[PDB]
Amino acid sequence: PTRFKKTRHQRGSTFCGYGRVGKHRKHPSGRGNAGGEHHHRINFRKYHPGYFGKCGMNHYHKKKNTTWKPTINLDNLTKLMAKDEAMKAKKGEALPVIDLLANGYSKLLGNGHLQAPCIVKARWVSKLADKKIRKAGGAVVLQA
Amino acid sequence: RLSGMKHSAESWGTGRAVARIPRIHGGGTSMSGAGAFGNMCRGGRMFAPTKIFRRWHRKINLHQKRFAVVSALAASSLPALVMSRGHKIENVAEVPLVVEDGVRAYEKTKEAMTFLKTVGAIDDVNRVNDSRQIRAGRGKMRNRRYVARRGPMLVMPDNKGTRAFRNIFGLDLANVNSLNLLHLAPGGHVGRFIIWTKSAFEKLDKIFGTFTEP
Amino acid sequence: PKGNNAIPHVHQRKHWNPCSSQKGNVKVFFNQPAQKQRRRRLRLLKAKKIFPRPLKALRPQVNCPTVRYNMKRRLGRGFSLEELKAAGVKPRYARTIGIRVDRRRKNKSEEGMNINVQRLKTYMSKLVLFPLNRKKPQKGDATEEEVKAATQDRSRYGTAAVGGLVTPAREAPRKVTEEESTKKMYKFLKKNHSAVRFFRARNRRAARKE
Amino acid sequence: GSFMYLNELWKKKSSDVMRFIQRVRAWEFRHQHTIVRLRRPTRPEKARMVGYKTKQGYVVFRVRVRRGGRKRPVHKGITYGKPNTAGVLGRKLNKNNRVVAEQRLGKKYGNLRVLNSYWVNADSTFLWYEVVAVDPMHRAIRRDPRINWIVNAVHKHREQRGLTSAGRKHRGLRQKGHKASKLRPSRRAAWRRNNRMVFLRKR
Amino acid sequence: APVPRTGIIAGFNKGYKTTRRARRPSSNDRYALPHKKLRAVKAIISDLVGFSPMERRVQELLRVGKDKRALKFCKKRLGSIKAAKKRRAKVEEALRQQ
RNA sequence: AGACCUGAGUGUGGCAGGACCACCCGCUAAACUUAAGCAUAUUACUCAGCGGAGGAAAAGAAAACAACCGUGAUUCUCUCAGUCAGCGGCGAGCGAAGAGGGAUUCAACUCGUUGCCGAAUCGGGUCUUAUAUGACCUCGAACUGUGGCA
RNA sequence: AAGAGAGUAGCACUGUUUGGGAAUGCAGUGUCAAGCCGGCAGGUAUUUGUCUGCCAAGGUUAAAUAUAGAG
Ligand SMILES: [Mg+2]
Ligand SMILES: [Mg+2]
Ligand SMILES: [Mg+2]
Ligand SMILES: [Mg+2]
Ligand SMILES: [Mg+2]
Ligand SMILES: [Mg+2]
Ligand SMILES: [Mg+2]
Ligand SMILES: [Mg+2]
Ligand SMILES: [Mg+2]
Ligand SMILES: [Mg+2]
Ligand SMILES: [Mg+2]
Ligand SMILES: [Mg+2]
Ligand SMILES: [Mg+2]
Ligand SMILES: [Mg+2]
Ligand SMILES: [Mg+2]
Ligand code: NA
Ligand code: NA
Ligand code: NA
* Residues in CB range of A112: below 8 A, 6 or more apart: A73, A74, A75
CA separation for the pair E59, E75 (Å, rounded): 15
Closest CA to D172 of D160, D159, D188, D157: D188
Asked if the bond preceding C60 is cis, omega within 30° of 0, the reply is no
CB-based contact B37:B7 (threshold 8 Å):
yes
d(CA D32, CA B169): 92
Report the alpha-carbon distance of residue C152 to residue C174 in Å, rounded. Answer: 46
Q: Which positions in chain E touch A124 (Cβ < 8 Å)?
A: 9
Beta-bridged to residue D113, according to DSSP, are D134
Q: Which residues in chain D have Cβ-Cβ distances shorter than 8 Å to B55?
A: 203
Residues of E in contact with D5 (CB under 8 A): 41, 44-45
D161 within 8 A of D114, measured Cβ to Cβ: no
Residue A17 phi/psi, 5-degree rounding, is 85, 25
* Alpha carbon of C187: minimum distance to chain D alpha carbons (Å): 41
E85: CB partners within 8 A, 6+ apart:
E71, E74
Q: Is the separation of the CB atoms in A107 and A87 below 8 Å?
A: no
Q: Which residues contact D68 (CB under 8 A, 6 or more apart)?
A: none
The residue type found at A19 is G
Q: Which residues pair with D127 in a beta bridge?
A: D65, D122
Q: Does E25 touch chain D (CB under 8 A)?
A: no
Question: Which 3 state secondary structure label does DSSP give D93?
Answer: coil
Contact B56/D201, CB-based, under 8 Å? Answer: yes
Query: What is the C-alpha separation between C157 and C57, in angstroms, rounded?
Result: 8
Answer yes or no: do C68 and A119 touch at CB < 8 A.
no
For residue E80, give every residue at least 6 positions away whose Cβ sits within 8 Å of its Cβ, in sequence order, or none.
none
DSSP labels for C136-148?
A: S--SS---TTTST
Contacts of D1 (CB under 8 A, 6+ apart): none
Q: Which residue of C has its CA nearest to D201?
A: C29
Which backbone phi and psi does C86 adopt, to 5 degrees?
Answer: -65, -35
Which of A67, A85, A130, A141 would you mutate first to test chain C, the one with the most C CBs within 10 A?
A130
Give me the DSSP letters along A107-130.
EEE--S---S--EEEESEE-HHHH
Pairwise CA distance, residues C200 & C182, whole Å: 32
Of the bound ligands, which one is closest to the alpha carbon of residue D157? 7
Interface check for B53 against chain C (CB to CB < 8 A): the answer is yes
- Tell me which residue of D37, D56, D51 sits closest to D138, measured CA to CA: D56
Which amino acid type is present at position A16? Answer: C
Query: What secondary structure, in 3-state letters, does chain B show?
Result: CCCCCCCCCEECCCCCCCCCCEECCCCCCCCCCCECCCCCCCCCCCCCCCCCCCCCCCCCCHHHHHHHHHHHHHHCCCHHHHHHHCCCCCCCCCCCEEECHHHHHCCCHHHHHHHHHHHCCHHHHHHHHHCCEECCCHHHHCCCCEECCCCCEEEECCCCCCCCCCCCCCCEEEECCCCCHHHHCHHHCCCCCEEEEHHHHCCHHHHHCECCEC
Gap from CA of A36 to ligand 3 centroid (Å): 18
Task: Judge contact between B99 and B196, C-beta under 8 A.
Answer: yes
Q: Tell which residue, D111, D158, D117, has the closest CA to residue D138.
A: D111
Please give, rounded to a whole number of angstroms, the shortest distance from the CA of C24 to a CA of chain B: 10
d(CA B32, CA B53): 36
Query: CA-nearest residue of chain A to C2?
Result: A43
CA distance E81 to D178: 27
CA of B36 to the centre of ligand 17 (A): 28
Q: How far is the CA of D76 from the C1' of G10 (A)?
A: 40
Which chain A residue lies closest to C69 (C-alpha atoms)?
Answer: A65
Alpha-carbon gap, residue C162 to C59, rounded angstroms: 10
Of B53, B58, B59, which has the smallest distance from its Cβ to D199's Cβ?
Answer: B53
CB burial string D83-108: b at 16+ within 10 A, e below: eeeeeeeeeeeebeebbbbbbbbbee
d(CA D23, CA D10): 15
Choose the mutation target among C10, C12, C14, C27 for the interface with D, i.e. most D CBs under 10 Å.
C27
Cβ-Cβ contacts under 8 Å for A19 (sequence gap 6 or more): none
Resolution (angstroms) stands at: 2.6
Are C189 and A124 a contacting pair at CB < 8 A?
Answer: yes
C98 to B186, C121, C148, C149, D30: CA distances (angstroms): 53, 14, 20, 19, 62
Residue C153: closest CA among C130, C133, C127, C171: C127
Q: State which H helix or E strand residue D120 sits in.
A: strand D113-122
